């Protein structure tokens, strides 16, 4: 397997097959391994980026996940003041996810890499190691409900949030 984005070392996590062949996908079990500190001696910090709309996130998200559905907010939160490790011997990892392990997560993942490359001298990167959560929140919740809060799941197409979906869409950069 290829090295991470800045060609400094191998990917740390075991991966599974996903829709986007060139992106790295991880299972819910691996996500839990990270959350339970199985890689604490190597990974100083990781950020779970929930790319779903606010109402979806509010209806149930992975503990500690940050909701960054808009490109400009994801870029500000991640690249304005890059999240770095307390030791340049430890790793920083990003994990993006959406609802059905479809397009919103992969899209943001590619966007961040594009911006990361743009503000660095090749091949250096602030976030060389990024993954997509296979199955999204839809598959994570039924596997590890106690790693979610609240313990529920609100689909993007929930019948009671049709207007909320439209309201959010009108804040995006492109459609
Ligand atoms: Cl997939
Ligand atoms: Cl956007």
From Swiss-Prot:
Post-translational modification, as annotated: Phosphorylated by BRSK1 in vitro. Phosphorylated by CHEK1, which inhibits the activity of this protein.
- PTM-bearing positions, type Phosphoserine: 81, 174
Q: Where is the active site?
A: 98
**Organism superkingdom:** Eukaryota
Q: Which residues form the Rhodanese domain?
A: 42-149
Which cellular compartments is it found in? Cytoplasm, Cytoskeleton, Microtubule organizing center, Centrosome; Cytoplasm, Cytoskeleton, Spindle pole
This protein's assembly is summarised as: Interacts with MAPK14 and 14-3-3 proteins.
Q: What does this protein do?
A: Tyrosine protein phosphatase which functions as a dosage-dependent inducer of mitotic progression. Directly dephosphorylates CDK1 and stimulates its kinase activity. Required for G2/M phases of the cell cycle progression and abscission during cytokinesis in a ECT2-dependent manner. The three isoforms seem to have a different level of activity.
Q: Which family does it belong to?
A: Belongs to the MPI phosphatase family.
This protein is called what? M-phase inducer phosphatase 2
Its source organism is Homo sapiens (Human)
Output the lineage of the source organism: Eukaryota, Metazoa, Chordata, Craniata, Vertebrata
